[PDB]
Design a protein around this nucleic acid. Structure first.
Ligand SMILES: Nc1ncnc2c1ncn2[C@@H]1O[C@H](CSCC[C@H](N)C(=O)O)[C@@H](O)[C@H]1O
Lengths: 916, 475, 193, 96
DNA sequence: TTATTAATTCCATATGGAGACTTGGTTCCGACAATATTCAG
DNA sequence: CTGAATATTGTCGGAACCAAGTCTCCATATGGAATTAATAA
C-alpha cells in the first residue's frame, strides 16, 4: 500500500465529478469513451485509471475549457513485449479535435521505479507513427502524475511539445527535455521549455523517490562509456566535473534567475553545442574560484570542464540535460528517508572507475575496523555529552573521501539512532543535538565544521568533494592542494579554518604545530618519491626532511596535526616496523606517541592491486608533561653513556692494545690501573654492555672480556649518525634504559583473513578475524515485519483464489461439452488441479514458516527489540535464521560492537587498551 | 588471529628497535642458559674467487638448491658463453660469487621458512661456487651437529627474525648474530656424539642409495610404450624440432571439418604420420565413446567448509586420481550427484600448459565421500570391451598422447590451451587387442608401484632422521 | 622530388603514408613520432578505423582514403581499393563503440557479429588494391577454433594466403603473453574471385 | 609542424595543464631532458620507439586490457616489412 | 482430417577467455665506504 | 705536509617487487529442446 495510493483511492471514492464511483466499469457515466478494449477485459486496469480519473476530474473541474463530451481517437499498434499491444496512448483529452492532437501518459509515483522507457513510450516515438498513419498534427505531450503535494496536489510532470525535435532520437539527444511542468487551462503553455526558474513553475523536481537512480545509472553508463578509444577514468572525471558544475549552478543561483544547467531551446531549434559548452565551462571555471579554492587566474582560465576531443559534444548535451530534474543538493529524499544520491555515486564509482594499481582505495572493512578500534563513537558521545562539541577527524591523504564518508555515517548512525541512549538531554546538549542532527533532510550538517582532508590529485579531490556534497555536507573543507605544506596555504573562504593556524613548538624542533584536531585517520602512500624542488621546499618544516623517505613525513605531519591527547590510526606498511633503515621514525613515534595498539594485517587486503604487507598502527599523542620527562631521561642516560664510552675506550686502549699510560685520560680512568681494582672496572664494562654480557663472562680476565666482546664494543660506541634530535648518543642504549624506566603494556595482534578476497574477477566472501557482523538487527518492528509476511501471504492467496476461480469456471464446462472439446476441457482442468496441489504445497510451507518466524520473534525479539541475553548475538541459532529464508531481506549490515566477551580482534581492542 | 601483549622495554631487544608482530611472537622472558653465536659459529666474510677460464666451473643459485639441502649446480664455461646463460655470467662478472671453504654451512638469506640450509661436507671433491645470497658460518662445534640442529631444530627462531620490508622476507648477518640458541638442546646433541653421527651417516647413505635408482613417473610410461610399437625415441625428438612445413591448399580440408590451417595442426599431421608408419592397429576414438560430460567449478575458498573440489594438479602421469582435495565450496546446483567422482571414471584434463593438457587418469580409489571434479575435467564413460580405460589413460599420458594434445589444443591464450570433445572424437590412436593392452598395463603398474615404494621409504627415513634428533635433544 | 634533399627527405610521407588511430593521445604521440622522424603527420586520422570512408576528412589535396563505391562481388558495399601494403595489429576482442555499431550492420559482410579482430580483416579487404599485399598479426584463435570458420572461409575466398608463421608466447612477455601469428596474404583479382 | 591553421585552438590549447600537472614536476621534466638530443640522436637509438615504450611503461595493464593497447615490438615490424618484399615492391613501383 | 514445421521461447551444456592466481628469489638502483683528490694553510 | 673532502672507485640494502610455473571461474552462445505451427489428406 503505497503513500499516494491511499489518497488517490480516497478521491476515487470521493470524486468531485462522479466518474469513478462505479467500480469495474464506467460505460454508463460521461467522459468514458476509450474505444472499450481490443485484447482482453474492459474493467479495473491497475494504477493507470486510478490517476487518470483524477486527471479527467481536474480537466473538467478547474481546467474547464468547456465540457464537450471527451471524444477521443482509437488505439494504434505497439509491438511491446509478448504479442502486439494495442494501447490508447494512456488517457486522452478530447484529442483537441477529431485527429490526435494532445497525448497524455498517466503514471504513478511508484511507477517511476519499474520503468523509465515509458517517459516517451506512448509519446514522441509513437507520435510520429500517429502522424504517419492517421496523418495528424500531434503537438503536446504530457508525462502526467500527481504524488501527494498538499491540497493543490501539483503535478510533478514532464510535459513536452512536438515542434522542437522532428524525431525522438534527437529528443533523447536533447536529454529528456520538458516544455511544460503544470497543466494549463485555456489551451495555453509556452511553446519552448518554461526553463528551470527556481522559484515556482518547474522548481527543481526535488522528490527523488526510488529506482530512478538506477535508471539514470544504467542510462549514463550505457551511453557515456560506450566504447571507442578512452580510458574509463577520464570519462568518470568529466562526469564528476559536470556534476560539480551543476552543484555550483545550484549554489550561485537565487530566486528566479533561471538556471544555466539547461539546453535553452530557443523557440524550436536546439542549442548549438558550442554555446552550451561555453555556458557549462563558465559554470565550471567559476566553481573552481568558489569550491576548489584556487586563486591563479591563469590556471582557472586556461582549462575547461570537458576535454572536447576525448568527450564528444553530443554526450555533453545528453549528460547536462539528463542530469537535471533532480537537485544534487537537496534532491535526496529517497521517498522518505533521504540519502539517495550517495548510492547513485557509489554506483557510478563501482561501475567505471577501473581502480587499476595507481589509484586504489582502502577497503571498507579496514576503514570500519580502524574507526571502531579508535572508539570514535565513544569519543564523539563523550565530547558531545561534556564539551557540547564533536571531534575534528582529518585525513591528510584523503582520496575519495573513503575515510571521511565512513566516519560521517558512523557518527550519524551511532549518536542519533543506535546509541542515543548514551546521550543525556541536558538542555544545552539537547540544543546542540537538534542543531546538528535532528533535521533529517540535512542530517549531515554537523560535519561542515569537523571533517577535513587534503588530496593532492585534482581529479581525486574533485571526486571526493562530489561524494561529500551528494550525501549532503560542506565539502569546502577538503583541500585539493598538497597535504605536506605549511598551514597558511590551506585557506577556506568561509567558516572557521582550523587547518590554517600554526605556531612553533618548544619541545619539537622549534617547528610549526597545529594541535587542533583529535582523530587523524589516513592511509599514507606506500612509496612517494616527491621531486627535487618539492623536497627542497619541505625540508624546513620536518625534523627528518633531509632523509629521502618522504613516506615517513606523514607521521611527522600527523604529530603536527594532533592536539595533546589525540588519537591516530594509520595503515602504515611493515617497513616502518621491521626495516633497519627506518629506525629514526620508530624513535620519533616512541618519543612523541604512546603506542597503544598494532594489528598485523594479512598480505591479501590489497591483493588485486598490491601485495605489500601493512600493519595498522594506533597511538595517542603524548602531552608536554611527558615529553619533558622523556627529554630529561634522554639526557640523564646520555651523559652516562658518553662517560661510559670514554672509560671503555680508555680500558680497551690500555688493557688490550697495550698503549702506554697517559695521565690525561681521566681522573677516574687513571686511578685504578695502578691499583688494579678489577671490580670497579668490571662494573663499568658490564654496565656499558647492558645487554651483551652473560653470567659465564663474570669470571673471565679483563683483557679477555674486551677481546671477546670486540667488534661489538665499537658498534655500541657510535652516535646516531646524521641526527640533531637524538643527540650525540647511541639511541639503542639510551632507549633501552628509558623504556625500562618508562614501560607500559602495548596491545599486539594479527589477522590472517579480513573477510574478503578481491581479485581481477570480482571478490568472494572469506572468514573474518577483525570484526563480526550483526546479522540479526537490534530493533525490528514486529508489526511492520509481520505485516510484510501477511502481505506475501495474501499475495499468494490471491493466486490461490484465482486458481479456484478457474476451477469453478471449468467444473461446469465438463457437462457442457460431450467428447471433443470435453477432452481439452478435462486436460486443462487436470493441469489446473496439478497447479492446485503445487500451490497448496507452497501454502503449507508458507504457513509453517510463518509459525517458525513468529516463534523466532517471541523467543528472541521479545517486543520490537532484542533481549539482553541475545544482544551479543553470540548464539549460532539466532544468527543463521537471518542468514537464510526471507529474513535475509531485512538483515543488518552493521558491525557488532560486543562488550561482554571476546570473539574477534575488534572485541578485545574495545575491551582492552584504554584511551586516556 | 593471535592476541598477545608486550611491554615497551621489549622493544630494546634489537638495536633496530623493530616492533613487528612476527619478531615478537617468539620474544619472551627466558630461563634457559642460552648460548650465543660467539660460542657456536663464526660468520666468514665473502670474497670473490679468481675463477679460471679453461676449467668449466659449477655455479649454483638459491633456486638450484633444494629444500632437503641438495645442490643441482649448472656447469658453466667462459669458452661457450651464449645468450641463454648470459645472465649467469653477468652475475659472476658483477661479483655475486664466492667459493665456500670446506666444512662451512651456507644458510640462504631469502625466505628462511623453506629451510634451504646446505652443508659443505668436509670430505669429497669438486667444490662448487655459490651466490652471495647465502651466508657463510664457520662452526666451532662439530659441523654436522650444528647443521642438523639448524635444519630440524631452530627452524622457527631463524624464521622469527626475517625482515620482509615491502617485499622479500630476508635475513642479515646481524639477525644470525642475534639468535639465542639454547644450551640443553645443543649440549645434549654435542655430548651424545660418535653415535648420532654414525646413525645419521648410515641413514643418509641408505637414502642416497634409494635415490640412485629413482626414475620419473613419465620416463617409465615412455620406456614401455617405446618398447612396444618399435618407436625410435631419438628420431621422434629430432623430427619434432623441425620448424618448416610446406603443405598445399588441397590438403587443408582432409579430415578437418572446420578448416584449421594453423602451423600447429599442420605439424600435428606430420608427427602423426611419422608415428604410425609401422603400426597398423589404429581406429578413431570417436567410435568407442559414449559420453563427454564436463565438470562443475563454483567459487571455492581454499580450505573452506563445504563439498571438496579437485584441481588440475591432482592428475599425475601415473594414471590415478590423487584424491587430495584442497578447495571447498558451499554452493548447490540442484544436480550435485552428476558432478561427483566415482570409482572407475576416466577423467581427462581440459585446460593446462601445452605439455600438461590431456592428462588422463582412472580413479581406482574407493572413497565414500563426494568430491566434485571441476569443469576442467572431461569424464569419458566408454565401451569397456576394447579400450580398457587404464590403457587409454596411460596412452594419453605417454608420448602418443603428449604430442597430439600438444598440437591440437585450441586456444588464443597459450597458457590455458584447451581440448574440446571434437578432438577426442577425432583422435586416431592405436588399439591393440585386449590381451595385448593388459600386458602393458601390468608393466607400467608394477614398475611405478616399485618406484612409489621407493618414494615412500625415502620419506620415512627422512622423517626418522629428524625424529632421532628431536628425541636426542629433548631427553 | 622524393629522395634527394638530405635535410628533409621524408617528403613522400605526407602523400604516400596513411594511418588511423582511435585514441587522441595515441594519435598525437604518433604524429610527434612522425615529425621526429622527418615529418609526415598529415594522414594520421584520429578517427575510428572501421568508420565509413567518407568520414575521414582531411585538409589537403590528395585524400585517397575517401573514395568508396559498392562492389559487385562483395554484396554491394563500400570498397576503397587503392592501398597496397596494408599492415596492422588489430586489437583482439575489443568492444566496439555504440555509435559505430549503427554502421557495422551495413557496409560489412559479417557485420552482425561483434568481433573486432575479425572485422578489421574485412576492412583490410576493403582497403587493399586488386593485387595489394597484406601482412597482419592475428591471434591463434583466428587460425583455430570452430567459431571462426566463416572468417577463415572469408579469407580463402577473396585473399590468396601466402604464408603464416606462429610467433612464440615470449613476444608480449610483460604485457599479455598471448600466442599470435603473422599472416601474409595477397588479394585476388576479380577475374579470380 | 602540426599545421594547425586555426588561430583560436592555439590561443586556448596548452602544453600541460598546470592544475592537473604541477609546475615543479614540469621543472623536473625539463631538467631531465635538457641535455638530451631527441633530434639527430635518433640514429644511435635505432629500433627504439621512445613514445610507444613510454606508453607501455606508464599505462597500467588494466587499462591496456579493455582496449588492445599492445604495441608490436620493433623486431617483428622490421620482419613484416621485409617478408612482404616491401623494398622490392617500392623499387618496382618507382621504376614502372 | 490433423500435426509438420520453424519460429520463439528456454533450458542445461560446451566452448573459450590480448587470463590470472601461487609460489619462490631474483635483478638493479641508491647509497656508501673507500678509493681517490686537492690545494692550502 | 697534514689534511679532509670530491673527484670517484667498487660494495650493501632495500624494493608502491616480479618472473616461473601452471592452475581457473564465468560470460555467452546455442541448439536442441520446448513452443506454435500450417500441411492436405
Ligand atoms: N602529500 C601527498 N603526497 C602524496 N600523496 C598524497 C598527498 N596528499 C594526499 N595524497 C593522496 O593520497 C592517496 C594515497 S591512497 C589514499 C588512501 C586510501 N586509498 C583512501 O582512499 O582513503 C593518493 O591517491 C594521493 O593522491
Amino acid at each position: 500500500m503505497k503513500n499516494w495510493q491511499r489518497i488517490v483511492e480516497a478521491k476515487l471514492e470521493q470524486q468531485k465529478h462522479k466518474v469513478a464511483e462505479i467500480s469495474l466499469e464506467n460505460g454508463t457515466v460521461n467522459y468514458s469513451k476509450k474505444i472499450k478494449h481490443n485484447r482482453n477485459l474492459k474493467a479495473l486496469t491497475g494504477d493507470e485509471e486510478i490517476v487518470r480519473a483524477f486527471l479527467i476530474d481536474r480537466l473538467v473541474n478547474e481546467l474547464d475549457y468547456k465540457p464537450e463530451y471527451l471524444e477521443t481517437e482509437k488505439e494504434y499498434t505497439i509491438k511491446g513485449g509478448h504479442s502486439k499491444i494495442n494501447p490508447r496512448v494512456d488517457v486522452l483529452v478530447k484529442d483537441d479535435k477529431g485527429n490526435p492532437f494532445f497525448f497524455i501518459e498517466v503514471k504513478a509515483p511508484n511507477k517511476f521505479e519499474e520503468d523509465k522507457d515509458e517517459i516517451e513510450g506512448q509519446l514522441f516515438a509513437l507520435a510520429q507513427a500517429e502522424e504517419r498513419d492517421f496523418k495528424t498534427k500531434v503537438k503536446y505531450l504530457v508525462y502526467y502524475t500527481v504524488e501527494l503535494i498538499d491540497d493543490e496536489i501539483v503535478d510533478r510532470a514532464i510535459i513536452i511539445d512536438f515542434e522542437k525535435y522532428p524525431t525522438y532520437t534527437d529528443w533523447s539527444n536533447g536529454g529528456f527535455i520538458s516544455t511544460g511542468t503544470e497543466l494549463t487551462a485555456g489551451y495555453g503553455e509556452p511553446k519552448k521549455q518554461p526553463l528551470i526558474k527556481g522559484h515556482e513553475k518547474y522548481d527543481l523536481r526535488v522528490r527523488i523517490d526510488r529506482e530512478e537512480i538506477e535508471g539514470l545509472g544504467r542510462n549514463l553508463h550505457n551511453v557515456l562509456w560506450g566504447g571507442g578509444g578512452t580510458n574509463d577514468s577520464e570519462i568518470f572525471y568529466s562526469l564528476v566535473n559536470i556534476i560539480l558544475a551543476k552543484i555550483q549552478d545550484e549554489y550561485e543561483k537565487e530566486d528566479g534567475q533561471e538556471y544555466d544547467f539547461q539546453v535553452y531551446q530557443y523557440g524550436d531549434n536546439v542549442e548549438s553545442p558550442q554555446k552550451l559548452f561555453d555556458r557549462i565551462n563558465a559554470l565550471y571555471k567559476r566553481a573552481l574560484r568558489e569550491q576548489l579554492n584556487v586563486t591563479d587566474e591563469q590556471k582557472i582560465a586556461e582549462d575547461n570542464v570537458i576535454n572536447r576531443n576525448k568527450f564528444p559534444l553530443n554526450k555533453l548535451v545528453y549528460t547536462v540535460q539528463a542530469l537535471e530534474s533532480l537537485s544534487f543538493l537537496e534532491g535526496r529524499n529517497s521517498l522518505d528517508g533521504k540519502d539517495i544520491l550517495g548510492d547513485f555515486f557509489e554506483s557510478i564509482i563501482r561501475d567505471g572507475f577501473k581502480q587499476t594499481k595507481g589509484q586504489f582505495f582502502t577497503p571498507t572493512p579496514i576503514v570500519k575496523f580502524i574507526l571502531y578500534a579508535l572508539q570514535l563513537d565513544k569519543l564523539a558521545i563523550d565530547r558531545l555529552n561534556n564539551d557540547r562539541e564533536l571531534p575534528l577527524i582529518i585525513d591528510p591523504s584523503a582520496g575519495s573521501g573513503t575515510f571521511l564518508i565512513e566516519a560521517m555515517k558512523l557518527i550519524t548512525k551511532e549518536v542519533k539512532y543506535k546509541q542515543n541512549h548514551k546521550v543525556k538531554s541536558s538542555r544545552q546538549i539537547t540544543k546542540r543535538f537538534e542543531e546538528l542532527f535532528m533535521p533529517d533532510h540535512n542530517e549531515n550538517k554537523w560535519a561542515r565544521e569537523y571533517l577535513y582532508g587534503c588530496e593532492i590529485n585534482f581529479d581525486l579531490g574533485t571526486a571526493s568533494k562530489v561524494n561529500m556534497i551528494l550525501h549532503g555536507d560542506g565539502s569546502a573543507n577538503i583541500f585539493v592542494q598538497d597535504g605536506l605544506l605549511p598551514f597558511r596555504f590551506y585557506v577556506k573562504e568561509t567558516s572557521p579554518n582550523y587547518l590554517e593556524t600554526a605556531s612553533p613548538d618548544a619541545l619539537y624542533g622549534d617547528k610549526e604545530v597545529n594541535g587542533k584536531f583529535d582523530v587523524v585517520v589516513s592511509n599514507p602512500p606506500f612509496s612517494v618519491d616527491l621531486d627535487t624542488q618539492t623536497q627542497r621546499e619541505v625540508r624546513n618544516a620536518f625534523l627528518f626532511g633531509d632523509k629521502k623517505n618522504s613516506e615517513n613525513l606523514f607521521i611527522e605531519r600527523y604529530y603536527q596535526l594532533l592536539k595533546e591527547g589525540g588519537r591516530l590510526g594509520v595503515v602504515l606498511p611493515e617497513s616502518v616496523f621491521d626495516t633497519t633503515e627506518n629506525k629514526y621514525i620508530r624513535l620519533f613515534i616512541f618519543k612523541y606517541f604512546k603506542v597503544k595498539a598494532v594489528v598485523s594485517l594479512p598480505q591479501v587486503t590489497f591483493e588485486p592491486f598490491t601485495s605489500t604487507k601493512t600493519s595498522l598502527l594506533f597511538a595517542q599523542k603524548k602531552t608536554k608533561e611527558e615529553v619533558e620527562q622523556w627529554n630529561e631521561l634522554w639526557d640523564k642516560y646520555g651523559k652516562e653513556w658518553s662517560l661510559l664510552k670514554t672509560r671503555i675506550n680508555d680500558y680497551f686502549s690500555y688493557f688490550v692494545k697495550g698503549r702506554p699510560l697517559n695521565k690525561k685520560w681521566a681522573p677516574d680512568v687513571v686511578k685504578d690501573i695502578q691499583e688494579g681494582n678489577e671490580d670497579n672496572i668490571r662494573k663499568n664494562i658490564f654496565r656499558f654492555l647492558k645487554d651483551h654480557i652473560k653470567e659465564e663472562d663474570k669470571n673471565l680476565e679483563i683483557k679477555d672480556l674486551l677481546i671477546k666482546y670486540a667488534e661489538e664494543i665499537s658498534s655500541i660506541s657510535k652516535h646516531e649518525k646524521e641526527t640533531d634530535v637524538f643527540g650525540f648518543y647511541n639511541a639503542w642504549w639510551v632507549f633501552g634504559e628509558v623504556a625500562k624506566e618508562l614501560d607500559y603494556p602495548i596491545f599486539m595482534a594479527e589477522a590472517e583473513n579480513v573477510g574478503y578476497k578481491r581479485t581481477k574477477k570480482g571478490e568472494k566472501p572469506m572468514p573474518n578475524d577483525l570484526y563480526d557482523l550483526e546479522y540479526a538487527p537490534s530493533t525490528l518492528d514486529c508489526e511492520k515485519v509481520l505485516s510484510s509476511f501477511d502481505i506475501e501471504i495474501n499475495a499468494l492467496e490471491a493466486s490461490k483464489t484465482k486458481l479456484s476461480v478457474e476451477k469453478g469456471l471449468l467444473e461446469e464446462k465438463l457437462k457442457d461439452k460431450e467428447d471433443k472439446e470435453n477432452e481439452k476441457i478435462q486436460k486443462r482442468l487436470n493441469k489446473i488441479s496439478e497447479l492446485l496441489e503445487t500451490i497448496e504445497n507452497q501454502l503449507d510451507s508458507i504457513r509453517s514458516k510463518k509459525l517458525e518466524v513468529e516463534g523466532i520473534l517471541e523467543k528472541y525479539y521479545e517486543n520490537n527489540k532484542l533481549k539482553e541475553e541475545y544482544s551479543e548475538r553470540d548464539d549460532e541459532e539466532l544468527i543463521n535464521h537471518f542468514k537464510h529464508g526471507v529474513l535475509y531481506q531485512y538483515r543488518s549490515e552493521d558491525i557488532l560492537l560486543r562488550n561482554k566477551t571476546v570473539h574477534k580482534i575488534l572485541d578485545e581492542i574495545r575491551q582492552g587498551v584504554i584511551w586516556d | 588471529g593471535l592476541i598477545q601483549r608486550r611491554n615497551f622495554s621489549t622493544f630494546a631487544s634489537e638495536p633496530s628497535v623493530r616492533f613487528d608482530f612476527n619478531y615478537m611472537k617468539s620474544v619472551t622472558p627466558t630461563t634457559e642458559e642460552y648460548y650465543t653465536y660467539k660460542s657456536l659459529f663464526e660468520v666468514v666474510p665473502s670474497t670473490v674467487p679468481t675463477l679460471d677460464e679453461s676449467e668449466p666451473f659449477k655455479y649454483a643459485e638459491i633456486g638450484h638448491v633444494s629444500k632437503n639441502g641438495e645442490v643441482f649446480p649448472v656447469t658453466l664455461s667462459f669458452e661457450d658463453r651464449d645468450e641463454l646463460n648470459e645472465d649467469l655470467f653477468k652475475k659472476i662478472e658483477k661479483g655475486d660469487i664466492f667459493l665456500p671453504e670446506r666444512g662451512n654451512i651456507l644458510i640462504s638469506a631469502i625466505r628462511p621458512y623453506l629451510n634451504k640450509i646446505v652443508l659443505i661436507k668436509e670430505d669429497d671433491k669438486t667444490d662448487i661456487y655459490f651466490t652471495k645470497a647465502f651466508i657463510q658460518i664457520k662452526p666451532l662445534i662439530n659441523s654436522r651437529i650444528l647443521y642438523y640442529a639448524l635444519r630440524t631444530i631452530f627452524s622457527e627462531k631463524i624464521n622469527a627474525v626475517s625482515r620482509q620490508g615491502k617485499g622479500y622476507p630476508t635475513l642479515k648477518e646481524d639477525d644470525l648474530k642475534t639468535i639465542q640458541f639454547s644450551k640443553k638442546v645443543i649440549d645434549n646433541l654435542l655430548a651424545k656424539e660418535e653415535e648420532l653421527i654414525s646413525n645419521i651417516d648410515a641413514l643418509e647413505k641408505d637414502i642416497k642409495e634409494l635415490k640412485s635408482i629413482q626414475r620419473s613417473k613419465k620416463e617409465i610410461v615412455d620406456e614401455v610404450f617405446s618398447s612396444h610399437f618399435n618407436i625410435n625415441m631419438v628420431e621422434l625428438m629430432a623430427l619434432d624440432s623441425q620448424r618448416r612445413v610446406d603443405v598445399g591448399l588441397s590438403s587443408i580440408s582432409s579430415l578437418n571439418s572446420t578448416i584449421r590451417y594453423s602451423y600447429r595442426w599442420n605439424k600435428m599431421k606430420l608427427i602423426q604420420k611419422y608415428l604410425y608408419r609401422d603400426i597398423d592397429c589404429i581406429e578413431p576414438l570417436g567410435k568407442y565413446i559414449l559420453s563427454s560430460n564436463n565438470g562443475w567449478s563454483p567459487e571455492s575458498v581454499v580450505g573452506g567448509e563445504g563439498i571438496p573440489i579437485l584441481g588440475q594438479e591432482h592428475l599425475e602421469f601415473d594414471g590415478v586420481l590423487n584424491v587430495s582435495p584442497t578447495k571447498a565450496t558451499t554452493k548447490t546446483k540442484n544436480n550435485m550427484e552428476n558432478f561427483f567422482i566415482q570409482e572407475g571414471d576416466l577423467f581427462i584434463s581440459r585446460g593446462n600448459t601445452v605439455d600438461l593438457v590431456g592428462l588422463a587418469c582412472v580413479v581406482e580409489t574407493e572413497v565414500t565421500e563426494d568430491i566434485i571434479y571441476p569443469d576442467l575435467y572431461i569424464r569419458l564413460k566408454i565401451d569397456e570391451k576394447v579400450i580398457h580405460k587404464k590403457y587409454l589413460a596411460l596412452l594419453f599420458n605417454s608420448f602418443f598422447g603428449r604430442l597430439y594434445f600438444k598440437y591440437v589444443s585450441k586456444g588464443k591464450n597459450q597458457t590455458m590451451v584447451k581440448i574440446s570433445s571434437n578432438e577426442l572424437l577425432n583422435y586416431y590412436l592405436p588399439i591393440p587387442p585386449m590381451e595385448e593392452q593388459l600386458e602393458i598395463v601390468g608393466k607400467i603398474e608394477e614398475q611405478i608401484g616399485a618406484q612409489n615404494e621407493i618414494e615412500k621409504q625415502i620419506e620415512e627415513k627422512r622423517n626418522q632422521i629428524r625424529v632421532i634428533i628431536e628425541e636426542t635433544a629433548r631427553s
